[PDB]
Amino acid sequence: QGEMALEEFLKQIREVWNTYELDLVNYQNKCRLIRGWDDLFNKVKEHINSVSAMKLSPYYKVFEEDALSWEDKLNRIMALFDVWIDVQRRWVYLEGIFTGSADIKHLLPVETQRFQSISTEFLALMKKVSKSPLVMDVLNIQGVQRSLERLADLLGKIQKALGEYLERERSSFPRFYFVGDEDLLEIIGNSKNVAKLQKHFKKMFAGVSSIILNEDNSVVLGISSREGEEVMFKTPVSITEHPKINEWLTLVEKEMRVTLAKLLAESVTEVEIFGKATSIDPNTYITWIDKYQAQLVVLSAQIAWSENVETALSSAAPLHSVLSNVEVTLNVLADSVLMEQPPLRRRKLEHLITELVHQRDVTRSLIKSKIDNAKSFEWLSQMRFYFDPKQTDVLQQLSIQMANAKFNYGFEYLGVQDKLVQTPLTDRCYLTMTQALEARLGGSPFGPAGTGKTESVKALGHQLGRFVLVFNCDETFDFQAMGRIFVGLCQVGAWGCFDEFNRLEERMLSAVSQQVQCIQEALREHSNPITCELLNKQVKVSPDMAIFITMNPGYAGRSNLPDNLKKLFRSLAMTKPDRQLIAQVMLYSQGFRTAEVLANKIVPFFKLCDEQLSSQSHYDFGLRALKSVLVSAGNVKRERIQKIKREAENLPEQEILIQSVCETMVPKLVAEDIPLLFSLLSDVFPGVQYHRGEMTALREELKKVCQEMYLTYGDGEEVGGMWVEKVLQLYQITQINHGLMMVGPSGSGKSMAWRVLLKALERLEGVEGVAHIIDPKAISKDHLYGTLDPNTREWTDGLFTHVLRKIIDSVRGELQKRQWIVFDGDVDPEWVENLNSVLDDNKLLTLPNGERLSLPPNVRIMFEVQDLKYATLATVSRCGMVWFSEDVLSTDMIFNNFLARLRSIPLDEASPMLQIQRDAATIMQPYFTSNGLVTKALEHAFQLEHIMDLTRLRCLGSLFSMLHQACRNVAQYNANHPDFPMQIEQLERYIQRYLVYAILWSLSGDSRLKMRAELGEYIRRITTVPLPTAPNIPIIDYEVSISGEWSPWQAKVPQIEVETHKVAAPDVVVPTLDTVRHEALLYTWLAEHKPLVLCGPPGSGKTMTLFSALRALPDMEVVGLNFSSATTPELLLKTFDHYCEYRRTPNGVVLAPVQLGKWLVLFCDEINLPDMDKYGTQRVISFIRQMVEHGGFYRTSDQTWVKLERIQFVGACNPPTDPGRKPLSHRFLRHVPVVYVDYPGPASLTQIYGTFNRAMLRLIPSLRTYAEPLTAAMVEFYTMSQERF
Amino acid sequence: HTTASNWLHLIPQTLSHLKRTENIKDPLFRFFEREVKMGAKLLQDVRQDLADVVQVCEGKKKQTNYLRTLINELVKGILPRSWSHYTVPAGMTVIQWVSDFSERIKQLQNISLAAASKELKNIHVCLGGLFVPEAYITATRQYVAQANSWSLEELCLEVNVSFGVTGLKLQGATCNNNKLSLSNAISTALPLTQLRWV
């Protein structure tokens, strides 16, 4: 019946596939293209999932043939359609540009001819596929794979060859300078599709996300933003005239400015007729607010207030009247916000509250002193707005003014954004930068990170209605790239906000100074068809151009600005903003009865928290943290009021703010600062309390996933309580934050924490979750982010840029999934500072190409790091922090995980191996539970000294490998004795001694003879296990045999006599105690293909012992590698190119040795020696750790994950105390056990070379009586020479 | 290395020991406990490194990379980066730095002895010897605010010549009954400064 059900499932697969045809749609009466990709991809994925599902269990062995045919047919159609979607997508816009664009054959005749050939081939394939829409019929054509690969390669070739036309097309419409080449060809080719253009307006305009169109897509009705706010054109532009794309898009750009000016005039008329009354109607006010856009409403309020103040100062009664009207409007604002509101108009009300409270403060300052004339500098200092309806030019009807600086509103549609709280520091910044802009000099604020530099520059640019662009410039911002973005900015008329400008390679900075000089000279000529020379070309300069420079002097030894460039920028120092004022205004805007009380309680709370708490490298209590707390407090207040309304009202604002503070700051704390912070909360807020939880559903499915993948689980006070609550904290920070960072010592369970959280979120929300793990140090910064070719200006994507671009494009439906990008390395300001504009609220990645990649809301960039000792505050403060303490992952957790993985998942992969695994686990449980023996031995081995820094998890994984070898040996005995299987009592008395032998060689394998003897005698004193009695021989010198007793290694070493032919041959080893012990131990490690490190002094015998071990395993091929000081992972890449080959598979690309069936082992002779960076990292060591833990690496050529198939590592090294050697990272040492091979010593050396000399003095049979004194003299002189020199 | 070992045995006569002194909710008590914890940890690190240099300098012990770097720094007379944790003025020489560290450790020993027996309120502390004085000032303000049940943000400072601070020195001024007079002297040492919050 089960077989019949499976046959019915395959028959249903046959029916659903034979009834499946490609859905072709006509493409404008020229062709018929295939659409509807997502359903096909999902169906193929779920069919392959089902095929793998009944493949595993239970009756797959009877019907293997048709299932194999189905799975490789599905893989083939998956590969074909994976190529096909990209080929069709490229061809659509390539045909669009090559048809609609003229003067192309006059420009690129060979390219046009090649594209006509490509189009003929593609059209022929389309006729062939339209003859038979059946998917198996399309698969039935031979040569489809090679044809599609050739088609894709030639389309990519013409893609790269089409680059010269793009600059010429960009010179027409200025805003095209901010999009990449591929997106620009998408724009040009889809100029008639139009609906495909809606995802590229974001990069081109300020706050424009889409354009409102007609049913026929012939006219552009208006512009909509990301938040749903809409602007409708007064006179719509018509594409039904068939203009060029640049022509109608320029018409759109002009029309939005004209329309915004008209709506601003109407709105300011409305506010003029509103503001004449001492009392206002909230209903009419709210209708006007909902009528006009947020930008225009804030602008109208500012214009009305400025006009009222000027008419009052024209002439204390009028000024008091102005203040009274402002306060009445502010009270109406606060009472309207205090109730529930729709979201967009709630943001509008919040912006108006901020603007009106700033105006109230300004009016109070004016009325506190005595002001009588409009020409007083006290009034002239603040920004003023003047609107004359008599002006016939609608663009220049509003004149923004500050002290001696006349400005025209840019009328760029900004959307909503976030209004900035007008600190007096922000007022001084506004004054200084408007003075610099009046003087035709770029502004340049500086100071410590997190004081409001780039945000204040953006706020000023938004106040003036200008387009501001934030560039996160790094060392790779060259002269040419800077010139390109300057000419783009100058042609558009947009501001420049170059952030972290002082990491810019001083000579290139001095070169940039010339372009900046030319820019301000052109601006001064404008200030009284003007051009300036940039990159040997005279280009138009818009009067709205500005350059702003954000710097952090003394950050990480950044490049000093030259005096030539410093004179072109007006400096302002912002070092401390008014935290009191910003918190008070934000809380009053979010809606809080005791807003001032809460601000006065929260800002000194952070001041005391920065000093009473401990000093750690990952703490931040600055303005960014304070603003995150305030925003989360507003969000949780909204959630609580919605929960109450679901049942005006009264809410515990204090408790809400404490909930937000704990939710944001509790995870970053160490285990010793939790009572201190809770005491601070109890002191500041007396009636505080603290409640958490109510995450029962996700907690239950978290338990389900933990039980699924052999993980332990707790409920707060159980064995897993701390780890589970840390996972919950990580989930909370993913919910409320932007970019995370998980910090803790190696062996804290953070990787398992985020994996289990991702799968629990999968099972809870039903949305697919995909995680990309990137090691930032295993590749250079060029491969991590990108590289600009100096010869031809083309950009090749890096690893992270490629991943983000793939997620943004979402060809395979990656926008709807859950994407997590994990930087599983370590942090230094070389590469993490390129993510300054990503983790900040800018939400974009800036490249030297000038192309910007916004961060989609489903992407959560996150870090998994060990320490933050080499990262700066500018990147510590931007990340939500979770601290995984070392005691989060207790040792009994890992013990239980090992025992569960022993009981399940048999090694040779019910089964005999599974049964013997279960028996071994059940007889070794009492030595693992609680303290037992292993925990005491491990805590003593911590107190011992070792040649490497001993981590718990290194020796613990080593012990697990030894126990797996014990189970394999028992299985070998069972296979060797089929008549008499392994009896349970001698199996018990064998495992009970193998565990002692294995803990000895695990916890004392990387130490000296006296220390391992000390650990042996400690184990003898502490355990109740039968041990071999000997007053002098330690337990380290004993082997446990398959019978169950202790066998000495002295009986294992023979008294061999080597022939005179091979006296000192390289492969000849006279066996001794250390030789056979290390031989057996190395065999134990290599049987499971576990990587290892052979440490010891040079010449001690490490590679000799390794080769003696490898010659006993005939299935392994050794490749020798030598590591110099200047060793880079290109050596491993070249070795993999030589001895291995790359093979494409349905589940990815794998790297395997050419020798089929054999195992390749890579021998690195000087694993310590690769040069350590100034930030304490080694590129080769990080690469090896990446491919040991993750089981593979990233191929640099095409940014594709490569999984090793049959590869393992062995390491040799001198002790880290030696002058040239450096200590390895504990994250790398977590995987590789170390065994310390020392010098043989005099007693062992005597016999080792006595055998050699007794063999060698046989060519002369009259001297054989002198071999012993000859060896004694040799050993004595060697020891004497070793002692002094 | 002979004179290196001579100076290396000269220095630690001013450095002996420090106790770690833990159930108190007083801000001053917990601040002084974490202060003496940091001081004891740094003293243990410095003394262990010093003993290692003694062993590698006069005796039988192999020199590691860390020991070679420390020996080179001590020979050049520049302060090692491992020992420098608190703020030192413009990179002081090791000879004066060890004396300053001895003064700080002796002060923390006096705090430990006073806490061995509120009790910690009556002591007079030099703000120079503390690893962070602004934290002490904020903790003092917190202590008076919690002991009086007063608002933290509305407390001014009254200065006289409930907490005593020693070692404060003026710059071109003199004091008499809390009156400032301009003087030609470079620095006049205030005997004891009295801090009260109102």
Ligand SMILES: Nc1ncnc2c1ncn2[C@@H]1O[C@H](COP(=O)(O)OP(=O)(O)OP(=O)(O)O)[C@@H](O)[C@H]1O
């Ligand atoms: N809740 C748990 N119960 C039992 N074992 C666990 C638990 N969480 C993690 N482990 C075990 O801890 C070991 C190491 O954990 P994990 O892989 O998360 O490393 P990590 O602490 O992130 O280290 P690294 O710093 O090297 O990235 C694994 O072998 C895993 O089986």
Ligand SMILES: Nc1ncnc2c1ncn2[C@@H]1O[C@H](COP(=O)(O)OP(=O)(O)O)[C@@H](O)[C@H]1O
């Ligand atoms: N006057 C202000 N009003 C509101 N928010 C502010 C103000 N000043 C700073 N912030 C917030 O504090 C943070 C400071 O970031 P910022 O210092 O501008 O970054 P950078 O260090 O790159 O200049 C931002 O999140 C900003 O929103």
Ligand SMILES: Nc1ncnc2c1ncn2[C@@H]1O[C@H](COP(=O)(O)OP(=O)(O)O)[C@@H](O)[C@H]1O
């Ligand atoms: N047990 C032994 N029997 C014979 N020769 C040995 C033994 N142990 C070490 N040797 C000698 O030591 C050398 C091996 O040292 P090696 O493994 O190359 O050290 P390293 O790899 O650190 O250079 C060989 O030349 C071998 O003659």
Ligand SMILES: [Mg+2]
């Ligand atoms: Mg910035």
Ligand SMILES: [Mg+2]
């Ligand atoms: Mg991990």
